[PDB]
Design a protein around this ligand. Structure first.
Ligand SMILES: CC(C)[C@H](Nc1ncnc2[nH]c(-c3cnn(C)c3C#N)cc12)c1ccc2c(c1)S(=O)(=O)CCC2
Length: 167
């Protein structure tokens, strides 16, 4: 868990302008969070990038999990191997509001983080999932009670988020 260059927002939330994949390779965290969908199909975005860094091992493991257990619920999670990125990967499904899912499920999604003492995570439901990223940071700060290190791979958005938090 050798996180470097993060800015501490609250006693348990830290943030950095960084690619979560590069962070996971350098830090070797106990847990890395994937921004998953309910069938664990890592087709693009954060999930595709994490799977590619495992050379597709994450996708094969995910398909076997879904065969035995069925899909996740929106707001839910499962723990699978971290492969070369972490000890464990926490696959968390935030709502996709561009596909009509309820933004109130973002609180449920972040509540999954509280079962793990330390996590490297992306900003849930941001990007093409369509949630307002400033709102997602506020739900993270108000919900997560364990130690979360957020990697946001866009300097423009990182600056907006920090300036929103410090108002
Ligand atoms: C807001 C945005 C800046 C942020 N992106 C990221 N945040 C942190 N580490 C990242 N690595 C990469 C990366 C690394 N390689 N490649 C080819 C990619 C891609 N794509 C992207 C990325 C973000 C946060 C949450 C979500 C998404 C995007 S989404 O659009 O994938 C939908 C799911 C929820």
């Amino acid at each position: 868990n050798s996180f470097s260059g993060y800015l501490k927002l609250t006693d348990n939330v830290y943030i950095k302008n960084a690619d979560i994949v590069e962070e996971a390779k350098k830090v070797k965290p106990t847990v890395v969070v994937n921004a998953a969908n309910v069938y664990l199909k890592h087709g693009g975005g954060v999930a595709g990038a994490l799977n590619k860094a495992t050379n597709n091992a994450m996708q094969v493991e995910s398909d076997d999990y879904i065969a035995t257990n069925g899909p996740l619920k929106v707001g839910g999670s499962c723990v699978l191997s971290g492969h070369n990125l972490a000890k464990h990967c926490l696959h968390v499904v935030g709502p996709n509001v561009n596909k009509g899912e309820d933004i109130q499920l973002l609180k449920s999604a972040y509540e999954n983080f509280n079962q793990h003492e330390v996590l490297l995570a992306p900003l849930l439901s941001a990007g093409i999932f369509g949630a307002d990223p400033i709102h997602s940071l506020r739900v993270c700060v108000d919900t997560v009670r364990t130690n979360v290190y957020l990697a946001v791979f866009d300097k423009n958005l990182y600056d907006k988020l920090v300036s929103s938090f410090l108002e």
